[PDB]
Amino acid sequence: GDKICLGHHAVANGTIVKTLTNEQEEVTNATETVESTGINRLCMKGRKHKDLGNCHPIGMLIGTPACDLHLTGMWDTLIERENAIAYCYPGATVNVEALRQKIMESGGINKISTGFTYGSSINSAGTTRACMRNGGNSFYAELKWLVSKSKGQNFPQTTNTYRNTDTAEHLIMWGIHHPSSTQEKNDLYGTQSLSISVGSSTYRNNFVPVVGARPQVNGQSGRIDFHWTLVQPGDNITFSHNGGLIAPSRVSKLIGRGLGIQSDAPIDNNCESKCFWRGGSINTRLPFQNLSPRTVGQCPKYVNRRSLMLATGMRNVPE
Amino acid sequence: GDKICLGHHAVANGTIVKTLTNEQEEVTNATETVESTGINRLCMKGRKHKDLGNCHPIGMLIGTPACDLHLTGMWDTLIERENAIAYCYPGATVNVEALRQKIMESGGINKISTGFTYGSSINSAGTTRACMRNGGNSFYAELKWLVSKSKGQNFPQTTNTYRNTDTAEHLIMWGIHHPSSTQEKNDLYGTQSLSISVGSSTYRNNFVPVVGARPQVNGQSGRIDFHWTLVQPGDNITFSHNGGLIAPSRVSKLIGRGLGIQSDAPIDNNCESKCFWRGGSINTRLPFQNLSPRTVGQCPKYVNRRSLMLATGMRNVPE
Amino acid sequence: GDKICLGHHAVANGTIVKTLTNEQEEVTNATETVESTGINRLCMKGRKHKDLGNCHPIGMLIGTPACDLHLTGMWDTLIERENAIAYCYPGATVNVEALRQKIMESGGINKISTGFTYGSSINSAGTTRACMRNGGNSFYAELKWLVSKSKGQNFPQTTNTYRNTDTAEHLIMWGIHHPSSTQEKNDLYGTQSLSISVGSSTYRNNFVPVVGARPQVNGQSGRIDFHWTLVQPGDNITFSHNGGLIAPSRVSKLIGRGLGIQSDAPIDNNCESKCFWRGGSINTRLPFQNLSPRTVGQCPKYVNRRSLMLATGMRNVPE
Amino acid sequence: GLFGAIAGFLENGWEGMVDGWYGFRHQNAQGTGQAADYKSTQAAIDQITGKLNRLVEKTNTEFESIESEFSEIEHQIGNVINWTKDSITDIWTYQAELLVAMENQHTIDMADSEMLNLYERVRKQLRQNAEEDGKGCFEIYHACDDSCMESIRNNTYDHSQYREEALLNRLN
Amino acid sequence: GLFGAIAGFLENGWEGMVDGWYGFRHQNAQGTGQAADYKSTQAAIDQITGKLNRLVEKTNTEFESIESEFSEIEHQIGNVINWTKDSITDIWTYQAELLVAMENQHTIDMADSEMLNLYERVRKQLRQNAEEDGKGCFEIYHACDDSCMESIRNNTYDHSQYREEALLNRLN
Amino acid sequence: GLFGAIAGFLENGWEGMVDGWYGFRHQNAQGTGQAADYKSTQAAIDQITGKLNRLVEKTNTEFESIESEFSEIEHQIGNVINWTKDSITDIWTYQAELLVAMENQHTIDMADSEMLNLYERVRKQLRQNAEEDGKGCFEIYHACDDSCMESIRNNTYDHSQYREEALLNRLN
Ligand SMILES: *[C@@H]1O[C@H](CO)[C@@H](O)[C@H](O)[C@H]1NC(C)=O
Ligand SMILES: *[C@@H]1O[C@H](CO)[C@@H](O)[C@H](O)[C@H]1NC(C)=O
Ligand SMILES: *[C@@H]1O[C@H](CO)[C@@H](O)[C@H](O)[C@H]1NC(C)=O
Ligand SMILES: *[C@@H]1O[C@H](CO)[C@@H](O)[C@H](O)[C@H]1NC(C)=O
Ligand SMILES: *[C@@H]1O[C@H](CO)[C@@H](O)[C@H](O)[C@H]1NC(C)=O
């Protein structure tokens, strides 16, 4: 009548998990593998970062008023916002998306001065009420609006060339003005047919201002479309123009690498994180997450499930 | 002299399967995981669908004769065919593929009337034997071929604007005519240099008719190339032209979402399905399939194998 | 006092491996699954191959001097090099990358003759010191630089058409010359406004020479930009031009399929391989590799790890 | 195999057993019989069924086309699309192959374990009143009537009732 | 289950055992006691811990965006991006689902094995001085004092010391 | 481990055994010997070999380039390509890591099971003429000559021939 018995533990409330053979095994304990809660803020601790607020990354290169505080600097993450303004004077940039990406992966920009001069017969200081400053009418800080100094005069066939004397590639932006009327065109530039030709050792293209009636925005019915390339070290880029060019007073140099975040989430300098998205920041040790398909940084892989429990205990057999 | 023995069942013809350690284990039964047989027909039961036959999705927007029956309607799947015609009068559309995709993912289109008027000095009813109708020479149903009413006269500098008064984005197509001869150009429009300028708050572009000798197709040696954008609600789009524009009499509004199928397989209204391809339809519970890499809808994932057997039985040890 | 004991073998120096539960199990033997050593040479045994050296694949079609030996032939792998030259006279090709891919996946080209003739009023043999030959000034072997025979004369409105009489699609390249001065433009072609119009049953486009000051390269400040399409069998492609066209004396026909390798690694006709990359060749039975993310041919999948040991033995319990 | 029973100390299966996966053969006074164990059979089938339920039944995301079948598509983009689809197929086929290999290994081995589990059940229930043949048989050192056999297979056998009796034949 | 013990010949767990995963219940002269086996417990937890360490802790490659959240993106490229992200998500979710299913099966079964391993240890250590109940108990045919019980659970029990004594009650 | 034998009730391996993975050590009248079991050894190697065959040997689809090494490629498309390759690499590396981890677990555990299977074979073949040491040894209660040892390792040992003799030393 003497004996020893062997047994295993159990618990009153088991957790349910999936296995290869059984969709509902009760085990003693389990733990979540999919992260479903994130932080509703941008965790910027440990980062030299830049919140552009209503300044748009492109606006940094051309120099929109909104971006006055963001024309230069250095950083390791950049934060774009839904608001953001690039174009005070209405327009568009050819290959926009390639460009903001380039910028958003940069971690810093310097502005180098073109040294362009124009002088007599030509007014290099056109402004507009769409780009107001302190206050008053003004313009894109890194460009000059060139217009016939007088009248409704033919604009001089002009030549400016930027020489890259640096060791690194520079990024050159310029604008082409497209007026709303034949009259307007004639007032600013000649009656002459207009042509802007741009040429480096690697780049070559040409543009023609083009008149058309258009909805008023903001503002004006004119448009300034922007264009860009990279000028290699020790190369030169030459503008041949007879009016219509919005020329560069400065070119940009993109410096390092950096992480680009697009979110309206508030900054929080008191949490670290490596993974971000539109709704904010993600900090988790788990390999999987459920918050978003679109993340940036070092992130748990996205999955299409609320929960995936991993058993951390034996089969739970109560009584 | 008494005994009890334990055993397992077996079968005369086992099935062969792979394991981690043995490429050929005979087991008692197994079952296929890769679907290799599909249905040689399009299973349209339970779907408000549209077979365009020889009408091409683009032809729906501009109004080719082939598409007369398909200028409007509503659907939840759209069926394109290898035949299909978009251009009665020879030409091309800039960003075609983006456009048919847009259309093929739509599940319906409405046509809103532009209200454009032209009147004296201008013939708004050009036709061509490449776009025949009932029968007779005719044209794209949603566009007007505009030509100098008389002669070989300069076409009037003209302005038409479409105002989007709806709550949704409209899609505007238009054509630019490119003639085969200087003579032809002069007959239809002026001797004046030609220019078409198009401008909304978001869009702006311009086009120039261009003469050239070209192989005859169908038909004629002229070409009409098409162009498009989306006009946002409460926005306006303005055409400034002096000849060459194939203007829109109606614009299109893409309605919902829908599934786009490209296949020459016959319709069958008596099977359901959720997965389709060129050769037809796929109905299977299995997670994998072997028929095609290119499928649409809810499909088993494609794999590069005829067969992958899953054991549903023990090791089979006969005798 | 008699007994039998059971045991397993062991070794003095075990190998360490990962399992689901233990990141460091010592086992008796194991073997690597990730290939980390490759061959610093291009293993070409068993391949009809072509090393272009400093000839660039595009140069094969237009006929740069560097490519004189490579204007025709047949092969099953093609080797591009970092050096390589396509443009003796400075310029660019529209849709370059699509084109070299096409070429790099070809395994052979034939040159068919266009049969174009020009005759009086027109000099079909323009040359340049940027495309030197044996030695002397010369030009792209498969193209003609057309220029006003005399003077500063208006170039004749000209028409040439290539008829594809073959059973296969041909690839047609042509150039547009963009001069550095209004003077230069006038010397070579007229004072007339210039236009080149190109048209097949499938293709239609048009180009305008455009003057601009530009950095000197090599060489010269002019540029010749190239353009291409495929002309289907039994179809014709017509050039209408009044100067500026660099016309084709031959068109190309891409023959088979072939494997395109880009590497500066030396050829070795004494090893076979199926997998290559920039640094050379990869020969391994293992399913995974660590050398490069960018490979071509039949390759082990790339992974982000130096080592992943697979146990080929039991748990090693020494003493 | 992994659990030593099926294709192990049992040298073959029984083609005659058609009422279940696992079962008993007995020899006794009244002669021979055969019968299947429904409980272990169902343990094994239920687990196979669980595998099939997992295999079948997956919500799929909806995919729209990105390659036109009838148009020509631009060459570079077409090549990037092709690279991506090929890459994805290599992943799925690899996955499908591993799935089937590992499931199959596990399925075979669980089948071997359920067989052992039943064998072990019977051994335990006999305690000292029988000993192990080595080939799936238990040599019973007492008079085990057809009804007594049925008590083993019904798992209602009382070893105490035949114990001291059975402990005799033990030594002779 | 796979190793027959937990949810097998043991018909339930012991909610009272809070000092470990595995353990002993004894009945003897001085009455009843319960105690957990720290060594087998730790074998099982350490393996679970290994699983968690593998699960957590993975170096991730850095990803930058390719879809703009605030801009519009071109339609065709957007669709190709969408196809690719969707395709990749299907793969990861499938992966995650298989990972958890196969780990969970293995985790449950290794827990079962460690329980068996301990049972087998005790059985072997008793040799002939006890026999198998069939439900995780060993019926001890000799006076096993609380100290003697402890010698079993301490794995220091000498069967030789009680052998011939125990071999007696055997037959009566 | 999972099957309790290797790194379980056997506290170590035998560096001296170089003829095979598994084997016997005997002590008897004529002294000591060692020998490897070729059959169980080959069961284990063959399965390892099956794993290697699966690992090696995969038809690969052919991939052509989509990134030019020497040209510049457009920035947006380049970024999309990069996203896709990085994403695919994360999948393969995860896959490779799981493959090895799960294979290794299984490989170790099957090696354990083959060792057990052999041990269980011998136990069964001895029936009552020997009992279980608890550490991989069977204590033989009869004169087992070198030839008799060989009969065990040759799996030709007849327990009936030494049974009643062996059942004696049993009780003294
Ligand atoms: C660029 O500029 C200077 C004068 O502007 C000239 O000496 C230099 O050599 C030029 N370099 C190139 C690459 O054109
Ligand atoms: C478009 O035109 C209407 C008047 O026709 C005007 O009220 C509306 O605000 C205009 N919108 C834009 C964006 O120009
Ligand atoms: C192509 O050219 C030839 C002769 O110029 C002519 O016979 C044929 O009709 C043409 N074919 C097409 C499709 O234009
Ligand atoms: C992509 O693949 C299809 C068939 O698999 C082929 O027909 C087509 O030529 C390919 N396109 C490119 C650009 O490689
Ligand atoms: C791509 O995906 C997002 C959400 O999944 C959606 O908002 C967007 O419109 C999609 N675009 C296309 C073209 O499928």
Ligand SMILES: *[C@@H]1O[C@H](CO)[C@@H](O)[C@H](O)[C@H]1NC(C)=O
């Ligand atoms: C794409 O990948 C390589 C390194 O893998 C790098 O050279 C390139 O600049 C990356 N591109 C971008 C645009 O982030």
